[PDB]
Amino acid sequence: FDSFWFVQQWPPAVCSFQKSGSCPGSGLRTFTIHGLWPQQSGTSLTNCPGSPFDITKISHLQSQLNTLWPNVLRANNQQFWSHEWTKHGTCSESTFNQAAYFKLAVDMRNNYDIIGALRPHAAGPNGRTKSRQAIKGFLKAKFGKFPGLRCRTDPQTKVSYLVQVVACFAQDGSTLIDCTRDTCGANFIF
Numbered sequence: 604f605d606s607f608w609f610v611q612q613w614p615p616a617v618c619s620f621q622k623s624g625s626c627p628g629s630g631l632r633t634f635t636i637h638g639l640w641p642q643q644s645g646t647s648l649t650n651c652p653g654s655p656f657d658i659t660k661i662s663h664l665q666s667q668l669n670t671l672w673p674n675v676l677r678a679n680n681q682q683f684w685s686h687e688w689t690k691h692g693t694c695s696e697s698t699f700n701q702a703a704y705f706k707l708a709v710d711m712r713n714n715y716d717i718i719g720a721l722r723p724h725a726a727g728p729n730g731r732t733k734s735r736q737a738i739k740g741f742l743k744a745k746f747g748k749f750p751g752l753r754c755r756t757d758p759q760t761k762v763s764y765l766v767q768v769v770a771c772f773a774q775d776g777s778t779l780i781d782c783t784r785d786t787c788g789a790n791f792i793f
Contacts, residue, residue, distance in 0.1 A: 638687045
C-alpha cells in the first residue's frame with residue numbers, strides 16, 4: 604500500500620438515510636471513526652489474507668474505541684471493529700499489527716478534530732447549505748492539507764448531504780498529504 608484514507612463519519616447524517624428501523628447514530632453529535640483504509644494506486648485495498656480479528660490484542664483501547672469508533676448503524680461495536688479489520692486492516696498488516704492499527708486510528712481521531720476546526724469560522728453543522736470549497740479550505744488551513752469530502756443524496760428529495768470526511772496519510776501513517784477525490788458536489792447540507 605502507498606497511503607491511508609482515514610475516514611470519519613457524521614452519525615446523524617449517516618442515520619438519516621435509514622428511514623426504517625433503529626439507528627444508534629441518530630443521537631451522536633460528533634464525528635466518529637468509520638475506518639482506516641490502506642490505499643494503492645488510487646484504490647482501496649480490501650480483503651487481504653491476514654490474521655483473524657483478536658479482541659485481546661486491543662483490550663487496552665476498549666474505552667477509546669467504544670467512544671470514538673462506535674457502530675452507528677447497529678448496537679454491536681465489536682462486530683464493526685472485526686469487520687473493518689478483516690476488510691481493510693489486514694491489508695496493512697505487513698507493517699502495522701492489529702494493536703498498532705487500531706491505536707493509529709484512535710490517535711488520528713484525537714488529532715483531527717473536524718468540528719473544532721470549523722466552529723470558529725461559522726462552518727459548524729446546522730442543517731444548512733455549505734460550500735465544498737469553503738469546508739475544504741478551512742480544514743486545509745488548520746491541518747495543512749486538503750481533506751476528501753464524501754456525500755450522499757437523499758432518494759426522496761434529491762438533496763446532497765455530507766456524510767464523511769477523509770484525511771489522507773502517507774504510508775508512514777503520520778504524514779498528512781492532500782486527498783484528491785470527493786464524492787460531494789459544489790454544495791451540500793451540513
